[PDB]
Write an enzyme that holds these catalytic residues in place. Structure first.
Site, PDB file in Angstrom:
ATOM      1  N   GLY A  18      42.063  26.200  24.089  1.00 42.95           N
ATOM      2  CA  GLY A  18      41.993  25.868  25.559  1.00 42.95           C
ATOM      3  C   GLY A  18      41.181  24.573  25.345  1.00 42.95           C
ATOM      4  O   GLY A  18      40.977  24.180  24.347  1.00 42.95           O
ATOM      5  N   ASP A  42      42.505  34.509  40.775  1.00 43.09           N
ATOM      6  CA  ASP A  42      43.677  34.276  39.821  1.00 43.09           C
ATOM      7  C   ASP A  42      44.382  35.354  39.253  1.00 43.09           C
ATOM      8  O   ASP A  42      44.616  35.566  38.369  1.00 43.09           O
ATOM      9  CB  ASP A  42      43.322  32.962  38.907  1.00 43.09           C
ATOM     10  N   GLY A  60      43.899  31.508  19.659  1.00 43.92           N
ATOM     11  CA  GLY A  60      44.420  30.785  20.893  1.00 43.92           C
ATOM     12  C   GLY A  60      43.453  29.450  21.060  1.00 43.92           C
ATOM     13  O   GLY A  60      42.210  29.517  20.556  1.00 43.92           O
ATOM     14  N   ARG A 108      49.404  36.971  33.398  1.00 43.19           N
ATOM     15  CA  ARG A 108      48.759  36.200  32.296  1.00 43.19           C
ATOM     16  C   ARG A 108      47.281  36.202  32.318  1.00 43.19           C
ATOM     17  O   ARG A 108      46.579  36.192  31.177  1.00 43.19           O
ATOM     18  CB  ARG A 108      48.942  34.717  32.526  1.00 43.19           C
TER      19      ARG A 108
END
Length: 290
Positions: free
Chosen positions: A22, A147, A20, A151
């Site tokens: 970001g 948060d 992944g 996810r």
């Protein structure tokens, strides 16, 4: 330094491949040597360094070093011998909980651990229970996550669910956030009225968010208030509009969601009580034929 953060030698880490990416960095599957007994698999987050500014990496390392528990993703240490800076976590084969949920959704394509297709009620309840337990730990330490969402949970071998993420959710799930002005993104669909209106975040707001997580779990990772824009969802939340009961969600679970969704933060149930209720329901799942 507030905690003796463990340091792994660069030679002990062998980056297998990228899992992944970001803005602040990317995640690799890797082989780490001499950790517990013997060449185990780990998830390594590499940073991209604003290096002097991104040295908050150290703070995150100290916090993650202190914040250790079951149902919280396991942190092993860091590597800072050179560029880039690496952070070593345990490998959770099923990836984030939202991805897992969508992969077992009624509308999906395509295992050894779990049957393909929809999970049973007991499984959903177990997942929920585990997330809730993680939150019990966090609230116990007076920590406000801020948060909470599927996810930001990870699913491991044997359907072990822990709270944790690699700090890429705003890139990977950009749609789950509302951009306010610039350089600040709010997970509005997961936020209680007092977070939205009064801009206050407490353990009780985390309780609300967990209600929303429950909703996600029972819609197989669907976005809350999907088909509504950001402002529309905001209006919904601030007007007392609750999320509809998922078709797979029994009334007893929807009552828990609704318990978390009390407008007045003091009227919501503690995370311990929610955890207890969910664990009980997981111990004896109610018949629900829809």
């Amino acid at each position: 330094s507030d905690a003796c953060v463990h340091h792994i030698k660069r030679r002990d880490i062998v980056l297998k491949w990228e899992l992944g990416e970001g803005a602040f960095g990317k995640v690799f599957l890797a082989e780490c040597h001499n950790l517990l007994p013997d060449k185990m698999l780990v998830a390594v987050k590499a940073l991209k360094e604003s290096e002097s500014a991104r040295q908050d990496f150290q703070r995150e390392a100290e916090l993650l070093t202190m914040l250790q528990h079951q149902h919280i993703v396991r942190f092993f240490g860091v590597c800072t011998e050179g560029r880039p800076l690496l952070m070593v976590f345990e490998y959770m084969r099923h990836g984030d909980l939202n991805r897992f949920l969508r992969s077992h959704g009624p509308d999906a394509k395509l295992g050894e651990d779990v049957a393909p297709g929809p999970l049973g009620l007991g499984q959903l309840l177990a997942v929920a229970s585990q997330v809730a337990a993680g939150m019990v730990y966090l609230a116990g330490l007076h920590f406000v996550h801020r948060d909470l969402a599927t996810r930001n949970c990870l699913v491991g071998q044997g359907l072990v669910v822990k709270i944790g993420d690699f700090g890429m959710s705003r890139d990977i799930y950009s749609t789950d956030y509302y951009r306010v002005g610039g350089r600040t993104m709010l997970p509005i669909r997961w936020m209680p009225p007092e977070s939205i209106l009064y801009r206050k975040f407490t353990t009780e707001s985390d309780v609300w968010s967990f209600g929303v997580v429950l909703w996600e779990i029972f819609t197989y990772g669907k976005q809350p208030w999907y088909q509504l824009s950001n402002t529309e969802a905001i209006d919904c939340i601030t007007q007392g509009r609750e999320l509809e009961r998922p078709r797979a969600c029994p009334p007893e679970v929807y009552a828990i969601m609704r318990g978390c969704w009390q407008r007045e933060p003091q009227q919501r149930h503690s995370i311990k009580d929610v955890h207890a209720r969910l664990q009980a329901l997981a111990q004896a799942p109610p018949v629900y034929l829809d």
